[model samples]
Target: GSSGSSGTGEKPYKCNECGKVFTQNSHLARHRGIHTGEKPSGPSSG
Candidate 1:
């Protein structure tokens, strides 16, 4: 469920509490100020 720390990704997850679209579903929970967000798969390291 990694989904954060990326500038570009499939931000298909949306929070019901707000309009902030998150790449990971867990992140939405974090955005709501509840639980922590999921880790982002992240971009390829250079």
Candidate 2:
């Protein structure tokens, strides 16, 4: 069971590609590298 949380005025994650803010840490972690000029090894062929 989980309780829905209300949105707050706090933005924890910011997208380096576009400066967009997010409320989740995962979103931020995935985007922080984009600002650092890092590239993925390869695209999945799946």
Candidate 3:
């Protein structure tokens, strides 16, 4: 039964440097670059 019950309020991944929290694992991986002063090269620069 996929009645919108898949979403949960559980945050599994957390940033150790910035203390920012994320629910998905991929988000946490991307956020880690903030600590190293790294920025995305394409589409992220404005």
Best prediction by TM-score: 3
lDDT score, residue 9, model 3? 41
Q: Which pairs in model 3 have colliding backbones?
A: none
Error of 2 at 9 (Å): 6.7
| RMSD of candidates 1 onward, in order | 14.8, 8.5, 8.6
Alpha-carbon lDDT, every model: 0.62, 0.69, 0.75
Ranking by lDDT: 3, 2, 1
Q: Cα lDDT of model 2 overall?
A: 0.69
Q: Using TM-score as the measure, what is the rank order of every candidate, best first? A: 3, 2, 1
Candidate 3 error regions (>4 Å): 1-10, 37-46
Candidate 2 deviates by what RMSD?
Answer: 8.5
Candidate 2 segments whose C-alpha is farther than 4 A from its true place: 1-10, 15-18, 38-46
Kindly give the stretch of ten consecutive residues in candidate 3 with the minimal lDDT sum: 1-10
Task: In model 2, state the lDDT of residue 19.
Answer: 69
Could you estimate the TM-score for every candidate? 0.36, 0.38, 0.49
Flag clash pairs in model 2.
none
Among all windows of 10 consecutive residues in model 1, the one with the lowest summed lDDT is: 37-46
What C-alpha lDDT, on a 0 to 100 scale, does residue 5 get in candidate 1? 78
